[PDB]
Write a protein that binds this DNA or RNA. Sequence first.
RNA 1: GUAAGAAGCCCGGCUCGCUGGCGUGGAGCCGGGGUGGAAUGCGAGUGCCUAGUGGGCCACUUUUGGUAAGCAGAACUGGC
RNA 2: UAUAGGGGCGAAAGACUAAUCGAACCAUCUAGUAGCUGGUUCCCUCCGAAGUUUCCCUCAGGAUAGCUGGCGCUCUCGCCC
RNA 3: CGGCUACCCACCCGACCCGUCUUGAAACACGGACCAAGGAGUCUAACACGUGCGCGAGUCGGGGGCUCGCACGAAAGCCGCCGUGGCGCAAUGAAGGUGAAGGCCGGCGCGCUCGCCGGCCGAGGUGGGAUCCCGAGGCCUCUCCAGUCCGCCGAGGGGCACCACCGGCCCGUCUCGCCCGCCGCGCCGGGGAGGUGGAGCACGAGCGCACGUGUUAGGACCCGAAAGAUGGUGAACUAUG
RNA 4: AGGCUAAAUACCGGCACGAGACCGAUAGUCAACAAGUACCGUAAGGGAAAGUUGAAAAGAACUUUGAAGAGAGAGUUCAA
Lengths: 68, 51, 147, 52, 187, 103
Amino acid sequence: AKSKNHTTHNQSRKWHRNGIKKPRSQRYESLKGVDPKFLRNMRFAKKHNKKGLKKMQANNAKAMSARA
Amino acid sequence: PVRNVYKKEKARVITEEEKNFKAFASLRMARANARLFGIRAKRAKEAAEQD
Amino acid sequence: PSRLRKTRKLRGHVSHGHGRIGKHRKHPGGRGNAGGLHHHRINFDKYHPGYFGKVGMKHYHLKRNQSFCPTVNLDKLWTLVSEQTRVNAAKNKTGAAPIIDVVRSGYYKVLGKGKLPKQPVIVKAKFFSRRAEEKIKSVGGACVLVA
Amino acid sequence: LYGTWRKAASLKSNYNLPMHKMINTDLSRILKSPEIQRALRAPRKKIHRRVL
Amino acid sequence: GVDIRHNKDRKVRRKEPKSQDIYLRLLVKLYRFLARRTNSTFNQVVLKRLFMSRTNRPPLSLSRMIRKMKLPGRENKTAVVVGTITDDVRVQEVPKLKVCALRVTSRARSRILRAGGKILTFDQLALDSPKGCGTVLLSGPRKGREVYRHFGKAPGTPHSHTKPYVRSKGRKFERARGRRASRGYKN
Amino acid sequence: APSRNGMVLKPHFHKDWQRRVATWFNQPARKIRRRKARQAKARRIAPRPASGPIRPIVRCPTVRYHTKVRAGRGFSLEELRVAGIHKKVARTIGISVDPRRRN
RNA sequence: GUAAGAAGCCCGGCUCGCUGGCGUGGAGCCGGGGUGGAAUGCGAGUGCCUAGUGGGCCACUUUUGGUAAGCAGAACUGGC
RNA sequence: UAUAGGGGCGAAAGACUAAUCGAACCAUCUAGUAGCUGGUUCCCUCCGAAGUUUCCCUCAGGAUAGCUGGCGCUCUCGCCC
RNA sequence: CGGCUACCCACCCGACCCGUCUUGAAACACGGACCAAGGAGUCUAACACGUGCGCGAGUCGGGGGCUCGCACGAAAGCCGCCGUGGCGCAAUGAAGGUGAAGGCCGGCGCGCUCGCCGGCCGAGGUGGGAUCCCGAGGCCUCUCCAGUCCGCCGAGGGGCACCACCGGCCCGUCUCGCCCGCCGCGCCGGGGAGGUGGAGCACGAGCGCACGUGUUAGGACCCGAAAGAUGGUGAACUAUG
RNA sequence: AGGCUAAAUACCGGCACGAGACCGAUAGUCAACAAGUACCGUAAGGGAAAGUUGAAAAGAACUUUGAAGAGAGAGUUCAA
Ligand SMILES: [Mg+2]
Ligand SMILES: [Mg+2]
Ligand SMILES: [Mg+2]
Ligand SMILES: [Mg+2]
Ligand SMILES: [Mg+2]
Ligand SMILES: [Mg+2]
Ligand SMILES: [Mg+2]
Ligand SMILES: [Mg+2]
Ligand SMILES: [Mg+2]
Ligand SMILES: [Mg+2]
Ligand SMILES: [Mg+2]
Ligand SMILES: [Mg+2]
Ligand SMILES: [Mg+2]
Ligand SMILES: [Mg+2]
Ligand SMILES: [Mg+2]
Ligand SMILES: [Mg+2]
Ligand SMILES: [Mg+2]
Ligand SMILES: [Mg+2]
Ligand SMILES: [Mg+2]
Ligand SMILES: [Mg+2]
Ligand SMILES: [Mg+2]
Ligand SMILES: [Mg+2]
Ligand SMILES: [Mg+2]
Ligand SMILES: [Mg+2]
Ligand SMILES: [Mg+2]
Ligand SMILES: [Mg+2]
Ligand SMILES: [Mg+2]
Ligand SMILES: [Mg+2]
Ligand SMILES: [Mg+2]
Ligand SMILES: [Mg+2]
Ligand SMILES: [Mg+2]
Ligand SMILES: [Mg+2]
Ligand SMILES: [Mg+2]
Ligand SMILES: [Mg+2]
Ligand SMILES: [Mg+2]
Ligand SMILES: [Mg+2]
Ligand SMILES: [Mg+2]
Ligand SMILES: [Mg+2]
Ligand SMILES: [Mg+2]
Ligand SMILES: [Mg+2]
Ligand SMILES: [Mg+2]
Ligand SMILES: [Mg+2]
Ligand SMILES: [Mg+2]
């Protein structure tokens, strides 16, 4: 009652029935896995960007609109 | 025989410091007092025992 | 509808929708949840994780009756009383506030959400959350505990 | 027993008349109205059959 | 043989609406005529949404239909919804905007008529805008359906966050082997 | 035996449920029987009203249903003594008497 | 296997509780400038439900065991 | 006349026990279960495989993935790039 | 006269007897003498998905009641201070329990890796994103003038559905830190900043009905056993007293 | 640690009754009929097949072949 054990015949033809797909697109890539000390940098940097970017960038926009 | 009584109490003015005293902490303080009522009595009995 | 059933459409095919080779006879894999640990672990696991074992305490004679506390939100806190009532009670009259008694509506515990306007009310309930209590203090209402 | 769309039914407690999907539903009147025929492309009745 | 390519004959599409509603078929006829005779891609998309199923047309809500017109540039525009606009318990004030939807609920219609807005139907929307000018087409929360929260690669293999089927959401039901590290494995 | 992603089922049909099937085919029959029973009661018994004895105002023992009210069973002998009438005289007047209900 | 661009370059400026001789470095955020960046062909992405299948064989070429087999067992491709 | 079924009887062959005996006959549970043979009922149109990975007291079977069909949704083109 | 045709015959060519188990059937593989009737995926419950309908943050009378005694009426109509109740609108914990809003401006405490007061907006931001809006400019038999008219558009803006990422809030554990309150100052409660696990929130879409597919329990696509138990009938054959 | 009591509930046995999106003599109960009958086994027990003339019997008087079964004429009936 010996049977055929293992083969990879008729496998690439099944693979190319659907055109094997790259993930091909991740705009603004996934962030998990990166260094937790770098995350402790980046989250506080982002929320203080939300806090204190207003007036200096506003005056810089006024200055660059006056210059050009 | 139902007679579902309907109390309304529609008009009253905003009042004194009941609104400053009836906060969330009263329920937690009452819960902690009900959970630690008897152990304080045991500690009072032990304080009376230890002279 | 047997005339809409697939069986009337499949009259003429020999094996009748179940193959000549595999031969689905009576019960090929078992019955019900057979082999939950032995040979169907890729179906019981990977589709129902957590299914095997004990988890916690065993509260004997439990009822879903003592822990009865329907939660009302601050969005649902207004329409228990009609809109005519709150308009004619907060149409710039005086410092009086209407009373919304959620125990009459059947809801016991008041929880917090957003969308609570400036016009203050008085809420009588058996329980509160600190978030909803701070929202009532922020809009200027009165938090009243009842039994 | 049923009412109009202004009031509710006075005999049935929680019933109102259904919502009317197309109010003025004369499709020939709509398609021959000047408001629709103001914004039509052109009557294109050429056939352009197979040329041997 | 000619084509070595696979025979994928029909693409995906639903041509005729499967609903046998006579009023829906009349709206399909009218907006099909407008979509093929007015060069209006708004009429194209509204005709496709009338071809769309009952389930894939989610019910719009009154607070969302306010907030999509609260944005600057949507003051004098009309809100066109292929679907139902329902009541919301959350909001208190309703603006003076116009509504063009199918099968608006009774409390929503009552509050719009109290606020002073104007509700319409699709035949009146077609008579007022054949090309669809002055309109904003809206859609509703499809992914917030209870059915779509069971859909994923797995219930728990990269923990997968996708809600396995069970009777009672609580203790003793699917919480032991694969849900905690003390009992066997953990996801 | 199981399949693709679906809820685990434990149906209680292993016991021979085919013998013990009770289906309400006599549900309009019981409806007509009980209509005739009520009408024959109102004919034959008395000009006493239907649901003859009067039921008390009674609160429901729970943390759940005690906000509501209920028609009870009987008038709680201390209450009947304060009302000032005899027990079986009250039962013949139409007062429902339950000796167990406290106050 | 990777790259053959607008998701890419360049300039100016804020934030950081990361780092630190230094406005040093690195990440994030904001504003602006120019899209003609190998060939060929094709209109693409994505969600749900499920049957059958889970005994294979043959042929060129590369091979394992056997003296060899219409023998047993592998790789690519094609066919039954 | 007595011994009646896991019982009887046996100068012992596991032989006999109503043409059936290495556990009689009749009825009921019972339509016992079977991964195992056989069969499975009108037409036309369209698409269309696999005998492979892993796991199982698994090797005639099942679960999973792959292959497949159906139902759609989101867009793109018809008017020097 | 013409006629395809379930009529018969001849001629040329091709043509092994169907169904299945199988890699392989015409097989020296199995079932089939012939014919007529019957004969095999049904039904219930539960779940999931898709579709259609009504109502829609609600939905549903299936449980009863009301009508005069009506064949069809074992139907149908109504209840609403009959919504008790099921599902959903809130989850997280084994549990005690707890429980989903933030943003902007001005002032103060050393705007302090730091809390408070007054006013305003209100479910955040980024890159895509059908559609929509504004619009330089161009074009209709001779000149200035015009209104709708024939008529697209570089560029710009607001941005459904959903996608990808960041940030925010809720619960349970983990780390580090200071403050507040007294129906009573205590091994009392609450709050802060980070990294986590959850079937969560981040303007909710469910309920009921019906149909289709699939799975499970029921005899369950049809037929099939060696076996087990329960209760009775036989020594007219045979075996022994 | 003594006791009774109608009610709403169940009823594939029985007596009478009504209805059917059910079957229509290989179906429906085994049994539309002299059906638990014929018949089988010592016994417990097993257990069938089997409806239809015509409106009315008016069921073909009479002649003839044959011993009769049967046949050829004649007749009844809308139709042998
Ligand atoms: Mg194999
Ligand atoms: Mg087939
Ligand atoms: Mg096989
Ligand atoms: Mg199978
Ligand atoms: Mg061809
Ligand atoms: Mg093909
Ligand atoms: Mg299967
Ligand atoms: Mg059984
Ligand atoms: Mg199948
Ligand atoms: Mg080989
Ligand atoms: Mg071999
Ligand atoms: Mg070939
Ligand atoms: Mg011997
Ligand atoms: Mg021997
Ligand atoms: Mg013998
Ligand atoms: Mg034996
Ligand atoms: Mg035996
Ligand atoms: Mg069977
Ligand atoms: Mg059997
Ligand atoms: Mg194997
Ligand atoms: Mg086989
Ligand atoms: Mg599979
Ligand atoms: Mg597919
Ligand atoms: Mg396909
Ligand atoms: Mg085969
Ligand atoms: Mg073979
Ligand atoms: Mg063959
Ligand atoms: Mg043979
Ligand atoms: Mg044969
Ligand atoms: Mg034969
Ligand atoms: Mg037949
Ligand atoms: Mg559905
Ligand atoms: Mg309720
Ligand atoms: Mg045994
Ligand atoms: Mg016995
Ligand atoms: Mg004898
Ligand atoms: Mg002898
Ligand atoms: Mg007693
Ligand atoms: Mg009784
Ligand atoms: Mg017959
Ligand atoms: Mg018979
Ligand atoms: Mg007769
Ligand atoms: Mg005739």
